[PDB]
Each structure stands twice: as structure tokens, then as C-alpha cells.
Amino acid sequence: SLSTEATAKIVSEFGRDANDTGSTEVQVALLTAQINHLQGHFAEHKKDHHSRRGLLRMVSQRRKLLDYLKRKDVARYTQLIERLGLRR
Amino acid sequence: MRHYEIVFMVHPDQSEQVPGMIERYTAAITGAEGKIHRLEDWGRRQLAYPINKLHKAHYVLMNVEAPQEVIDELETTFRFNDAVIRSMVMRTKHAVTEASP
Amino acid sequence: PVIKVRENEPFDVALRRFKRSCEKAGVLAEVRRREFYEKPTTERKRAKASAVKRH
Amino acid sequence: CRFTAEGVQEIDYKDIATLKNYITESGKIVPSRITGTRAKYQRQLARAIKRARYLSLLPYTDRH
Amino acid sequence: RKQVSDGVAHIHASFNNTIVTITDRQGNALGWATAGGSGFRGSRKSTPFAAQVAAERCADAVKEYGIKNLEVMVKGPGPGRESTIRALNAAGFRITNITDVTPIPHXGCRPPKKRRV
RNA sequence: GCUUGAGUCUCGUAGAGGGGGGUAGAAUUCCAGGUGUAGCGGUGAAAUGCGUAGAGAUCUGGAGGAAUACCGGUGGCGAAGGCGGCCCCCUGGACGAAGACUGACGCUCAGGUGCGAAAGCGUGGGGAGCAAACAGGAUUAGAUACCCUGGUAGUCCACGCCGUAAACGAUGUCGACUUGGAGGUUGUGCGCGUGGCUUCCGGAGCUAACGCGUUAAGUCGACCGCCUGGGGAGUACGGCCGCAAGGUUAAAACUCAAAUGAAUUGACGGGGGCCCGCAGUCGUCAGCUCGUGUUGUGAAAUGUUGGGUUAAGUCCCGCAACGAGCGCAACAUGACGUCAA
Ligand SMILES: CN(C)[C@@H]1C(O)=C(C(N)=O)C(=O)[C@@]2(O)C(O)=C3C(=O)c4c(O)cccc4[C@@](C)(O)[C@H]3C[C@@H]12
Numbered sequence: 218s219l220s221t222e223a224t225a226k227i228v229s230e231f232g233r234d235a236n237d238t239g240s241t242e243v244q245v246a247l248l249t250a251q252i253n254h255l256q257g258h259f260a261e262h263k264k265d266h267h268s269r270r271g272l273l274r275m276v277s278q279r280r281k282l283l284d285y286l287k288r289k290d291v292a293r294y295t296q297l298i299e300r301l302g303l304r305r
Numbered sequence: 306m307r308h309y310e311i312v313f314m315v316h317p318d319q320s321e322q323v324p325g326m327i328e329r330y331t332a333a334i335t336g337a338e339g340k341i342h343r344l345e346d347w348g349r350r351q352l353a354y355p356i357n358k359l360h361k362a363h364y365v366l367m368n369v370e371a372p373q374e375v376i377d378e379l380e381t382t383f384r385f386n387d388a389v390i391r392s393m394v395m396r397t398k399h400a401v402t403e404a405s406p
Numbered sequence: 407p408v409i410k411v412r413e414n415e416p417f418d419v420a421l422r423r424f425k426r427s428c429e430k431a432g433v434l435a436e437v438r439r440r441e442f443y444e445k446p447t448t449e450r451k452r453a454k455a456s457a458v459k460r461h
Numbered sequence: 462c463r464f465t466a467e468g469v470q471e472i473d474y475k476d477i478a479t480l481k482n483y484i485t486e487s488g489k490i491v492p493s494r495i496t497g498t499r500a501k502y503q504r505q506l507a508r509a510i511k512r513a514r515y516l517s518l519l520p521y522t523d524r525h
Numbered sequence: 526r527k528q529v530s531d532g533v534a535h536i537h538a539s540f541n542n543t544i545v546t547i548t549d550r551q552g553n554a555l556g557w558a559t560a561g562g563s564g565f566r567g568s569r570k571s572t573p574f575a576a577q578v579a580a581e582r583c584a585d586a587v588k589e590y591g592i593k594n595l596e597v598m599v600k601g602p603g604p605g606r607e608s609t610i611r612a613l614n615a616a617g618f619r620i621t622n623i624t625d626v627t628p629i630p631h632x633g634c635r636p637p638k639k640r641r642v
Numbered sequence: 643g644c645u646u647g648a649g650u651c652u653c654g655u656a657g658a659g660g661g662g663g664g665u666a667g668a669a670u671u672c673c674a675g676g677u678g679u680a681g682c683g684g685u686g687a688a689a690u691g692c693g694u695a696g697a698g699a700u701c702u703g704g705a706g707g708a709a710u711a712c713c714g715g716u717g718g719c720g721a722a723g724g725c726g727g728c729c730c731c732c733u734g735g736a737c738g739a740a741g742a743c744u745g746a747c748g749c750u751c752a753g754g755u756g757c758g759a760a761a762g763c764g765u766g767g768g769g770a771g772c773a774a775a776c777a778g779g780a781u782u783a784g785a786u787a788c789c790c791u792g793g794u795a796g797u798c799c800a801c802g803c804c805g806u807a808a809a810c811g812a813u814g815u816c817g818a819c820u821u822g823g824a825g826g827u828u829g830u831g832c833g834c835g836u837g838g839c840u841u842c843c844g845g846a847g848c849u850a851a852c853g854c855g856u857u858a859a860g861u862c863g864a865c866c867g868c869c870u871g872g873g874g875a876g877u878a879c880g881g882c883c884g885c886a887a888g889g890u891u892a893a894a895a896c897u898c899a900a901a902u903g904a905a906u907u908g909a910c911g912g913g914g915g916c917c918c919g920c921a922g923u924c925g926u927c928a929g930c931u932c933g934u935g936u937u938g939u940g941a942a943a944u945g946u947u948g949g950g951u952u953a954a955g956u957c958c959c960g961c962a963a964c965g966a967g968c969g970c971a972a973c974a975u976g977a978c979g980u981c982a983a
Pocket residue numbers: 879892893894
């Protein structure tokens with residue numbers, strides 16, 4: 218999983234504060250960081266199906282949070298996907 | 306850094322080579338900004354069963370804080386040293402300083 | 407199961423000490439268990455059955 | 462259970478004097494139903510014994 | 526005909542037969558007998574009595590070596606585990622040790638399939 | 643807008659969760675050599691087989707593969723399939739404590755997509771043990787079997803395919819609510835609490851019954867999947883998928899008046915326990931019944947079972963049964979019935 222330090226950085230960049238761990242932007246940024254990190258794992262470990270199920274849950278959760286944010290605030294949504302480099 | 310507990314046991318004829326090996330292996334670790342929390346030379350003990358005809362071996366314990374690569378490097382040294390008949394490297398959660406049984 | 411026959415001990419006492427060491431170690435039951443292959447399904451069924459009658 | 466009573470956290474593979482209480486003379490690990498070890502400590506004990514056996518601090522069997 | 530004060534009796538007690546082999550303590554065989562080669566075939570071969578007679582005849586086979594004391598290595602589950610050792614005692618050997626040496630795999634190889642009798 | 647559903651963060655906990663790499667000890671087989679000598683092996687009994695060209699046994703050295711005794715547990719983990727020596731590397735989930743944070747972001751899900759035991763298939767490796775096929779030996783009326791001696795695919799590894807199993811709790815997922823008892827396992831607060839997971843018993847209720855019973859098959863709500871007599875048939879045709887084996891979707895004509903579930907009384911078993919007998923009929927065997935009560939929706943059950951004891955349902959003691967009749971016994975005598983004898 219993501220380190221305490223790497224997590225704390227992401228909360229600082231995308232959150233309102235260090236305490237603001239709940240915001241959709243932070244949550245999406247955290248999921249994105251771990252999805253990107255795990256690409257190296259699954260490149261090496263192609264038949265780690267059990268861990269991949271956890272990755273696909275991260276992907277699905279991110280998709281649901283982005284869809285929530287899109288319909289709640291299109292502008293924040295647009296900013297976020299630019300910063301994180303997501304298609305949608 | 307990660308905390309490791311290392312046991313290795315040396316061929317009883319190379320018991321006199323062990324002080325040089327200990328100071329060499331600790332030199333490898335200290336050079337990587339690593340720490341030595343414990344270092345016990347248990348000396349020649351009776352083996353519970355024969356390992357490669359031998360009935361005794363010279364045990365050395367050391368608890369170490371280091372990067373994983375220098376530990377990986379130290380395991381390859383044990384592999385390719387015929388004096389080192391057997392070794393075990395174990396992750397520990399915390400540092401261990403206090404003396405063993 | 408390894409008995410050293412102790413001094414001024416008769417042979418029956420030596421031999422029953424060997425018998426008791428064997429039954430404690432469980433040699434013959436382990437041999438009889440390993441004579442034939444038991445499918446894992448059969449093993450689990452046996453384990454469950456023993457448990458249901460233990461309780 | 463001694464390990465619970467005596468406040469033990471991690472059973473040490475190096476503590477051969479302790480481990481010898483939980484093996485038979487054949488070298489086999491004694492069941493928890495005999496010794497009254499708690500399940501959590503029985504698992505630690507089994508691991509400790511298997512490490513000790515690897516390092517030839519304990520025998521696997523009474524006939525090497 | 527060399528003298529061999531101390532020896533080892535190896536008892537191979539299978540379900541079908543008993544082989545008694547007396548060796549020196551290097552494991553060089555000095556003499557042997559079997560339940561099958563002692564006037565017992567089929568059902569009688571796999572009995573404690575046939576194992577007794579095998580042990581008696583093995584003691585006769587090693588008469589000239591002057592073996593006085595024996596260790597006993599017992600191997601297998603068969604009917605001639607105990608009766609063999611009693612016979613070696615009756616033959617006038619000093620039994621010093623008794624050891625079970627039955628092979629037990631620590632898992633090992635898949636055994637043959639169960640018989641559907 | 644809100645924080646109660648859902649989610650994020652912090653600290654910690656247990657775990658055969660997964661992927662990769664390394665390594666240990668036991669054992670089997672094989673090879674080489676020593677000692678030793680007539681058997682070994684196998685079965686119900688044998689024989690095939692192995693062995694004087696020195697087996698089997700025993701000791702020493704070596705090679706190689708596969709699986710990890712004990713621990714071990716109605717134990718643990720995983721969506722399911724499944725996962726078990728030890729060590730390291732990479733990695734998924736769960737749970738608890740105390741807050742902080744987001745602010746309905748949720749539940750379910752046709753089509754879709756992924757994962758999916760074993761066998762099987764492709765290419766390349768590997769091959770100890772085991773073992774479809776196959777061969778021989780037995781058994782038998784025969785024995786294309788069961789048993790024995792061998793033994794190839796396969797079982798193992800890499801990568802790809804297959805997509806099925808009594809893939810089962812034969813029980814879809816999510817949420818709420820509704821008496822108890824005894825355990826297991828794993829957290830945590832001060833003997834006493836409080837969470838998670840799990841096993842057994844049982845209450846109301848439910849159920850055709852069996853049973854289920856806060857882990858519901860109870861009481862409700864949301865959404866999905868599926869059924870509509872037995873066969874024909876999960877078959878044909880068509881489509882799609884597959885290297886193939888085949889999978890998946892899925893009819894009709896025709897045919898029967900049943901098929902089926904659970905439970906009841908018998909009878910029967912090459913099921914178990916306990917007894918008896920020189921081991922017209924069954925059989926002089928000790929049985930067979932009824933009234934009333936009670937239990938069950940009901941067929942029925944109880945009594946008549948049970949602990950003892952007896953030649954005996956003989957007698958005693960217990961018991962939702964309480965009594966009674968025909969038998970037993972007592973004073974040759976054949977209970978209710980059976981064989982359309
Ligand atoms: C008209 N309708 C579309 C029918 C239908 O609903 C079918 C179904 N499975 O529900 C068919 O299979 C149906 O579509 C269909 O395919 C039919 C058939 O294939 C055949 C064939 O091939 C040969 C004989 C009879 C039939 C059949 C009577 O079963 C056909 C019925 C078809």
C-alpha cells in the first residue's frame with residue numbers, strides 16, 4: 218500500500234488542509250497514486266489475480282467518485298482530471 | 306530502512322576466520338548508513354543433526370538495520386562462501402539490542 | 407522410540423518401555439494411515455465425522 | 462498457557478530451553494490440547510520450533 | 526569366524542513376512558533368517574510364531590561369530606515386532622538397546638490406491 | 643443543506659489470501675560399492691514377477707523428482723474456485739481503538755467483462771512416487787471388472803487454451819427488525835464489559851414434513867436470476883464460442899397418467915446390538931391386541947419402549963400413560979394370524 222509520507226503529501230496538494238482526508242479530490246488522488254504504483258507490480262506479476270481484484274476495486278471506486286464530482290461540480294472535476302492526467 | 310536478524314554458522318575448521326568475517330560483514334552494513342543493534346559470537350556448538358558430515362558449527366548472531374539491497378548482497382556472500390554452511394535472514398519488526406538465550 | 411536397556415532391569419520392563427514409547431510416538435497408526443492414498447475429500451469427511459462424535 | 466501467564470509476546474526460536482518443553486523425545490511438536498498453550502501461542506511456537514530445526518538447534522527426528 | 530562381541534539385530538517386520546538380519550555395528554551382515562524360509566508359507570508366514578522361529582534360526586546362523594550382546598532395530602508394522610525380540614532374549618543375547626527405525630515420510634511420495642476388496 | 647448509509651485518513655492486530663525467488667529435513671525410486679546367502683514379493687489362497695548372472699535384508703556414497711509428518715483445531719484466510727515446511731521480495735483484503743474528514747458519493751444489475759476444481763488440449767521442459775490405456779497373473783459359468791505383478795498418457799514446471807463439477811449450505815445480493823443457552827477464533831475498555839468472524843443446541847414463528855431458528859427456511863423492503871407434470875431433452879435445428887474434446891443459447895412431433903417430495907406401518911439387508919432351539923403348518927414361538935387418555939395436519943405413535951431379571955410381554959423398578967383381553971403360568975393344553983395349504 219501507499220506509504221504514510223506519500224499519502225500525507227497527496228492530502229496536502231489536493232485537500233483544503235492536512236485534516237481534509239475525506240474530499241473527493243483527495244480520495245481520487247490517493248486511488249490514482251496507488252493504481253499508478255501497482256502498474257509495476259502487475260507488469261512483473263501478471264498472474265497475481267487475487268491482488269488484481271483489489272486494483273480493479275480501486276479503479277471502480279475512482280470511477281464512482283469522479284462521476285459524483287462531475288455532476289456535483291464540473292469545474293472541480295475538470296481541474297482534477299487535468300492535474301492527475303486522467304481521460305475522464 | 307528495515308530491521309533484520311541474521312544467524313549464520315561457519316565450518317568449524319574456519320572458526321579462526323570468523324572474527325575477520327564479522328568485522329567485514331558489519332563493515333558492509335555500516336558503509337550503507339546501516340546500524341548493528343546486536344552482535345553475538347555464540348562460538349562452536351553441537352549441531353542437533355549432521356550438516357554435510359559435520360557435527361559442530363560456529364554460530365554468529367547479528368541484528369541489523371539496513372537497506373534491503375545490502376542484505377541481499379550479504380546473502381549472496383553467504384551463498385558463495387563455502388565456510389558459511391548455513392544462514393537464516395529474518396525480518397524483525399523493531400530493533401533488538403538485549404542479549405539472547 | 408529409542409530405549410537404552412538400563413542396568414538391573416529385566417527384559418519385560420525394557421520391552422514394555424519400548425512398546426509404550428512406540429504407542430506414544432504413534433508409529434504403527436502412522437504406518438497404517440500411509441499404506442494407501444486417501445483423497446483430500448475423504449480426509450476432510452473423516453475429520454468432520456470424528457469431530458461430530460467428539461462433540 | 463505459560464506464554465499468556467508469563468506475559469510473552471513473541472516466542473523466540475533461540476530460546477531452546479523453553480522450546481524443548483513443547484517437543485516429544487521423538488522431536489515432534491506437542492499438541493496444544495496436551496500442554497494447554499493458547500492457539501495464538503501454539504502457532505508462534507510451531508514457527509519457532511521449525512526455525513530452530515532449520516538452524517540445527519533442535520532435531521527434526523530422534524534418528525538423524 | 527572372527528569374534529564380534531557386540532552386534533545389531535535388524536527386524537524387518539512387514540505385514541506379509543519377517544526378515545531377521547544380525548549385523549556388526551558397521552552394518553556388515555553376519556547372518557539372516559526369515560519367517561518364509563523357516564517352514565511357513567501364506568497365512569502362517571505372517572504370524573508372531575513364524576517370526577520367533579526366524580529369530581531362533583538367525584541366532585543359530587550367527588553362532589560362530591561369538592556375538593554376546595545386541596542392539597535391536599525394529600522396522601515396520603508387522604506381526605513379528607515383539608516376538609522376534611523375545612526370541613533373541615531367549616537365545617541368550619544381552620539386549621543393550623531397542624530402537625524403532627520405521628520409515629515415516631514428512632508429508633513424501635503418493636501411496637498406492639486403496640484396495641476395493 | 644444535514645450526517646445517521648457509503649467512503650477517506652491516522653495507530654495497531656491476526657491470517658495455509660495472492661505472485662516471485664531461495665532453502666531445509668524425512669521418505670520413495672534409481673545408480674555405484676561393501677557385508678551376506680537363498681529366498682524375496684504378493685494374496686482370501688495363489689500365480690505372474692524379482693533372485694545364485696548374488697536378490698531380499700543391511701551399511702556407505704551419489705543422482706533425481708514430488709510432497710511438506712508433528713503443529714492441526716466443526717482452527718484460519720480468500721468473491722467463489724481454492725490456499726498448509728521454513729526464509730526473503732512484491733502485493734490484495736479484513737478487523738479493532740480513538741478521533742478528524744467528505745457529504746447520499748448508495749443498493750441491485752439484463753446485456754458486457756473478469757476470475758473459475760479436476761479431467762482434457764497446444765508448444766517447450768520435467769518425470770521420483772502414483773496411475774486411465776495397455777500387458778500378464780488370478781477369480782468366475784463368463785470377468786473386456788473388483789484382487790495381484792507391471793505400466794504409458796497424465797499427475798509436476800512455463801506460457802496459452804478449455805469454462806465445466808453433487809462448482810453444495812443443493813439456500814442470489816443488500817439493508818432493517820425479532821426470546822435464549824453452550825463453545826471456538828480474533829481485537830479492544832475498565833472478575834466485569836464491548837466489537838469482528840465462526841460452530842453446536844434450541845424458543846416464538848415458519849415449514850408438506852424433515853427441519854430452519856438473530857449466520858432464518860422468522861417478520862419486512864430493493865433489485866436480479868430461475869420454475870410451471872414425467873419423458874422426448876439440456877436433445878435437434880440455427881447462432882455464437884472452442885485447435886479439439888466440446889460448451890453456451892434452446893425447441894417440436896410424439897408418448898404416459900402419472901413422475902415426485904417428506905414422513906408412517908411392515909418386510910427385507912452379504913447393516914448393528916442382544917438372545918434362543920440337537921442349529922396340518924410357522925410354533926408351545928412369546929408373542930398379539932383393545933378401551934380411555936395423551937402426542938402428531940395425518941398414515942400412525944404411546945402403552946408393549948427403557949434399567950435389570952426370567953423358560954416366559956416372567957417379574958421388579960422407572961416411564962404420558964392408566965387399565966384390560968387373548969396368549970405365559972396355574973387350575974395334555976397350540977394366542978392374534980400366515981400358506982385362496
Ligand atoms: C416460432 N417460434 C419463433 C418458435 C420458438 O419460440 C422457439 C423457442 N425455443 O422458443 C424456437 O426454438 C423456434 O424459434 C425454432 O427455432 C424452431 C425450430 O428450430 C424447429 C426445428 O428446427 C424443427 C422442428 C420444429 C422447430 C420448432 C417448432 O421448435 C421451431 C419453433 C420456433
